[PDB]
Paper text:
Next, L-β-aspartyl-4-phosphate is reduced to L-aspartate-beta-semialdehyde (ASA) catalyzed by aspartate semialdehyde dehydrogenase. This is followed by a Schiff base formation with pyruvate and addition of ASA to form (4S)-4-hydroxy-2,3,4,5-tetrahydro-(2S)-dipicolinate (HTPA) catalyzed by dihydrodipicolinate synthase (Mtb-DapA)8. Mtb-DapA belongs to the subfamily of N-acetylneuraminate lyase (α/β)8 proteins. It contains an N-terminal (α/β)8 TIM barrel catalytic core and an α-helical C-terminal domain19. The active site residues Thr54, Thr55, Tyr143, Arg148 and Lys171 of Mtb-DapA are largely conserved among its homologues.
The structure of Mtb-rDapA in complex with α-KPA was solved at 2.4 Å resolution. The Mtb-rDapA-α-KPA complex structure comprises a monomer of the polypeptide in P42212 space group. The structure reveals the presence of α-KPA at hydrogen bonding distance from the residues Thr54, Tyr143 and Lys171. In addition, α-KPA also forms hydrogen bonding interactions with Thr55, Arg148 and Gly194. The Mtb-DapA and Mtb-rDapA-α-KPA complexed structures superpose very well with an RMSD of 0.3 Å, indicating an apparent lack of conformational changes in the protein upon ligand binding. The proportion of inhibition measured at different concentrations of the analogues showed that the IC50 for α-KPA was 21 μM and the inhibition constant Ki was 32.5 μM at 500 μM pyruvate and 400 μM ASA. The IC50 of Mtb-rDapA pre-incubated with pyruvate was 160 μM, which is nearly 8 fold higher compared to pre-incubation with α-KPA. These results suggest that α-KPA competes with pyruvate for a binding site in Mtb-rDapA.
Numbering used by the authors:
A (entry chain A), B (entry chain A), C (entry chain A), D (entry chain A): 4 to 300
The structure:
Amino acid sequence: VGFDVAARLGTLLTAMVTPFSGDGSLDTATAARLANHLVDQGCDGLVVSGTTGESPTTTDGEKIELLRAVLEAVGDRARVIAGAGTYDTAHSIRLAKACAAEGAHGLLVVTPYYSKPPQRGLQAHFTAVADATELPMLLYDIPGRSAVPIEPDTIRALASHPNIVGVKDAKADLHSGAQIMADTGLAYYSGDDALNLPWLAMGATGFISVIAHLAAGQLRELLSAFGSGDIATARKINIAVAPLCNAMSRLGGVTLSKAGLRLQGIDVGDPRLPQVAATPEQIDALAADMRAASVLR
Amino acid sequence: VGFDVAARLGTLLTAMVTPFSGDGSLDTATAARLANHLVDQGCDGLVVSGTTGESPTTTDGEKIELLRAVLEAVGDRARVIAGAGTYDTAHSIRLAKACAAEGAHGLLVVTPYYSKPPQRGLQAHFTAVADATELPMLLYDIPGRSAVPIEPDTIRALASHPNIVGVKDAKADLHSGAQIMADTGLAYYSGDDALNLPWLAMGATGFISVIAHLAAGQLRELLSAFGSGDIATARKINIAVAPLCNAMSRLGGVTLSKAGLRLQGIDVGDPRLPQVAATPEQIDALAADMRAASVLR
Amino acid sequence: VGFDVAARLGTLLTAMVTPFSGDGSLDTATAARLANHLVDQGCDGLVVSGTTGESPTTTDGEKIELLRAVLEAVGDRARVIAGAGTYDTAHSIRLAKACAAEGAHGLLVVTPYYSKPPQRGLQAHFTAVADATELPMLLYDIPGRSAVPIEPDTIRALASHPNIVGVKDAKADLHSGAQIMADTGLAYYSGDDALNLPWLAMGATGFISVIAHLAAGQLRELLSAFGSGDIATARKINIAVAPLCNAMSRLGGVTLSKAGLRLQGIDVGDPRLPQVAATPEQIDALAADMRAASVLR
Amino acid sequence: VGFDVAARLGTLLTAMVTPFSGDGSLDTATAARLANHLVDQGCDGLVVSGTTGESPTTTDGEKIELLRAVLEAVGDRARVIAGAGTYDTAHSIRLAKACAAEGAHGLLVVTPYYSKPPQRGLQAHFTAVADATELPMLLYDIPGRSAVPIEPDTIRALASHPNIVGVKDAKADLHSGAQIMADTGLAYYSGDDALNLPWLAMGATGFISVIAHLAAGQLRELLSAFGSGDIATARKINIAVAPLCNAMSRLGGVTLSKAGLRLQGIDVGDPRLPQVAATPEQIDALAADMRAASVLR
Ligand code: NA
Ligand code: NA
Ligand code: NA
Ligand code: NA
Ligand code: NA
Ligand code: NA
Ligand code: NA
Ligand code: NA
């Protein structure tokens, strides 16, 4: 009205892993160093306690404890987004309020997973979560993980809420997303690194990326080259970071980002169970893809 | 060695809804009345805080608070199984221990959902959960909800753990389940009412049912008729309760069981968000199926 | 009215491979020897030019040429069913008429594949195919191959046609098939060997089997043991032939049956392209499963 | 070497419907008028007897009969591509040779459908089809219809054949297609109108389109605007023709193009069974989308 999601939330965001100490405890120090690193590499925004941040296995206290550690570290020169979504509506209301109290710049609310609620339950869920805080709220539609999509009718109905300002899409329905962007003006962020460039063509605002952990610089130049009309360079850069997308397919984001950051000298620990760290064979394969993406050696 | 899952855990179990007061609070009183009702109707076992018990939206305290309320009510003449599974391994370890401390007769551990861990993460997860307690542990394989299956190799590896004694299957891979039963001797329970009779033919031990909320008597006679070789009667009874399976397809288990119990005079409240209670049109459709199953009017 | 599909079409049918000479020509002689073999092993019916009979790669002339070769060989003591289904309605009308002219005992019409017609196109298709001949017509519902299912409403509408008498189900919707059998009285045949026993429990009439090529005797005893109420023996026999179902999963029916028959001394040739014959590694794996099923060595 | 697929086969191709007379006969006259219309509207290439051309329900003679009618009509100022793919390798060899004898400019070979051959069968199939003619051959990968994909390893192996020059992709794996284009230099054509613009961003050469039947002019300007770096105009035009993509989702290409052409004054007949023509309700919905795309009234 007129909100600017590009400035409010960013254009190159990394869904940051939650670093853990050698014993498994929350490592606030490694979080700030990685937060400064990702911003210094080209990220104007960060998502904390997203999917890749191991939100399933971190407590309410550790989430707020991480949120301030990232805010005081990079909150001056970068936007900080807190993931406040569970399969529990009342819990999501407390998390979004507490994240608001700590001064997070935005909210990322994932589709309630596992329980497979009907669409009107999802609309009532998101409406209640968007009511809890005057922060800008991003819809996070990932049916491959949550077992239900946000249907296009549900997204359009929630588009009229003043706090719901955009969608982080891991559904890959580019034709539907392109029409929702044009019709309602919601800002779309690619929640799928493999489709970053197709999403820009559809009109997306930016990336809430995973391989930005290891290649935020190239992704920044991809966004720059696409906005400046040089599509051949964005495609050239997208082919360059393609091997990191292949490695994410083999490993998944949590295992990839933690094993990849260690090979870049930035040890962030190992994932909490039921997630596991990369095997030696997976590490060597990850490194070959990273040497292909010119982000190793 | 030789464990008897049929006696240890039961043969007709209802994944009991968690009743809620008119304000949304945990209703321990309605839980006992429903627990006595389900046992008096033919259930020799009960599952508390399963999928249908709205485990996503109930606290750790409310789960233990419900567990004792059901144990003191029916624990003498029925087996009580506590669902202790999340996408958080350490949380599942605390829940399974606390449920053990309260004297639950068994554990139901669902495949970690949403985060999509690899198979070796699942094996390490379940192994750590089975280590936490000498209770008999049931695997709960529902890839339609959790977004990952327990592969047959993973089930067989976990079959050698002394506490993992069986599988609640909502995967419908009857050919694989039949071979796992024959090879490892794990007890299978139908986690899909629509496939109750096909599962008995494959060798299942019983039902961890949802429509038993409304038709536990007929399901008991189905198990009786099948064990006594009268397959035509079990099939006759399965056709009789088929409309309740159709209604579960339209509504889902949580909405169906709560709306259905109210129409049977046993008001248990409404589901917690993001789940919703049945609409008037859904209630009238549910009633027509229930009148077809001869469990209404 | 009252038709007896069990006598009209059979109870143990093999979707017979179409044998080919060493040069790829139609081998009528090997067809009769295999037809006599399958009947002498326990099959009271046969399907010619089905999916496993390589209907995609055989001409109209070779189909009729095969139909008479099987009729004169076993048509006295066995039922012969001709597959007359393509994605071409008018072609299916000529094939079903010509198969009728040659005295086939029934028709097997597959869901038109590839072109994905809407349901009313399917209903109009099957209605026109059932009109062309007063032979008993079997619906063949295999959405995994044809890319569209026959919805339950379509099957029920086609159930009132006097020539459409049953369904060969490769859709695995046991709950829907059980209700269609009870409501309309259509005869169901398992088009999925892995679900043969679950289909009997649902009320199926028999098997239109693939692994019967190699284990028709055991399947006959499975049908006998299930009809005589001995479910534990049918399950014991189903576990015995389970390795052949695993091999069919790896290879597919055409490659499995031709490579398996050669190892049983009954060489029937190699499949026509785009299908291929088993590799040496696939042959050795097939043999290990066949030695497990006690149908080799 | 260096082939120019953009000139050899075109950049805006319409998979042309096969027009039929009022009695169902092949209408060569309506084919030429539509062929001249589509070229005069901006199509530099045409595909005959593709999926949308009702290849399942047209004879070998009618296909060649249509091929010459389109060649003599527009073969001077447009490229004509003949679809020569079935689930029958030897049949595909005769069709591709006969289409070559009639002077078609290229071949479109679809993945063998229904029979689900393994990958090495597909590689051997396409290799044998590419051997039959020195025409440029386009791979057509549509697993949603054919029930098997062409795996990326299969496409790369077939990329070294001199006659296989590109891929018509209806698989939507933009990340894989982008890497195959960069690695092997195969020309990709969007076989999915909804993903036309994402495919251009990935580097596709053009569209083998369906909604070009009704909006070839706008699609031409979309290709022009994208090649000239004006991405915002291509996206503006893609949103304009989006309602035609929605109508194709409801109807399918054969029903949409024939019902849509009639509303544009160019009656081409009705589809052959098992396909059906649009219902009055479907016609009115199609017209509303066409009035939205500014291609009606
Ligand atoms: Na959707
Ligand atoms: Na919708
Ligand atoms: Na599995
Ligand atoms: Na496995
Ligand atoms: Na169906
Ligand atoms: Na239907
Ligand atoms: Na593929
Ligand atoms: Na591959």
